[PDB]
Design a protein around this ligand. Structure first.
Ligand SMILES: Nc1ncnc2c1ncn2[C@@H]1O[C@H](CO)[C@@H](NC(=O)[C@@H](N)CO)[C@H]1O
Ligand SMILES: Nc1ncnc2c1ncn2[C@@H]1O[C@H](CO)[C@@H](NC(=O)[C@@H](N)CO)[C@H]1O
Lengths: 143, 147
């Protein structure tokens, strides 16, 4: 798994259309979204992650939570982003792991939002530009 | 080298402070920068790239130029983005490679812009969301990974 963390003033998205046959079902309201003073987590689930979804998810939750603590953010936004890596996990497993992370962060007590899985989306983001505003993590399960 | 390409409506940056003891020398007017309808190339120079800076720069110029052609981006913005990777190349070497990449894209005929090297910068971007609006490219010396 590859994670790109951007501490932002805001994150806003707009769904264009589906990028695969079976995307996450969405209601009209889910086609757009926005969050402010938020740690945006762009995540690409890699095929290596298929080896142990729970393991990679738990570690991702931990790493993202720690960064959120470091940048002093209470809002986090999970953004499916297939283009951080070239070795992607199958859609079904990718969506599952992304939902695990999303739920795990909520379990830590954060205010979490997320964009729908399986769509092409336009987005706007404003990075704060502080020393820890842009960080990344490479997480691979081994168990 | 890891590259994240974002075809955007615009890119805007604001230098917040220096991240290195001796960042790239720039002037006041360069503390803020902007470019419209551009292919933004966020680049992290990796440790492995130290083995052959020229080889990596050349392949980076080619990969970036190919995407620009694909999405019809006339403007390209070289944006140093260290944390795109976890295994970074020496700062001085990174600077050198980014300069070579900039020079190469300019020679290709594109309108090239760039963000100053060695600073912490806030930035605003608007990804167009098209099928090729977000792409990833990994470029490394052949000697460090038969590719
Ligand atoms: N391994 C993976 N990791 C994360 N996301 C993945 C994935 N495989 C598929 N997706 C989702 O399907 C859309 C098209 O690939 C992906 N869409 C996107 O990455 C949009 N930002 C494009 O504009 C994403 O929602
Ligand atoms: N290996 C590397 N690849 C690309 N850029 C690198 C680098 N090593 C150092 N830099 C530059 O120094 C700033 C602090 O690391 C970096 N600054 C940044 O990446 C800003 N986006 C932070 O806001 C960058 O200008």
């Amino acid at each position: 798994m590859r994670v790109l963390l951007i501490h932002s003033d805001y994150i806003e998205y707009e769904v264009k259309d589906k990028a695969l046959k079976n995307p996450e079902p969405i209601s009209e309201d889910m086609k757009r979204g926005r969050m402010e003073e938020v740690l945006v987590a762009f995540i690409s689930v890699e095929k290596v992650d298929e080896k142990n979804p729970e393991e990679v998810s738990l570690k991702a939750i931990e790493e993202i939570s720690k960064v959120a603590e470091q940048v002093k953010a209470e809002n986090v936004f999970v953004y499916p982003f297939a283009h951080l890596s070239s070795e992607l996990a199958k859609p079904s497993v990718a969506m599952d792991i992304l939902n695990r992370v999303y739920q795990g962060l909520k379990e830590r007590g954060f205010n979490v939002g997320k964009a729908p899985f399986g769509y092409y989306k336009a987005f706007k983001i404003s990075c704060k530009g502080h020393p820890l505003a842009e960080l990344s993590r490479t997480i691979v399960p081994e168990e």
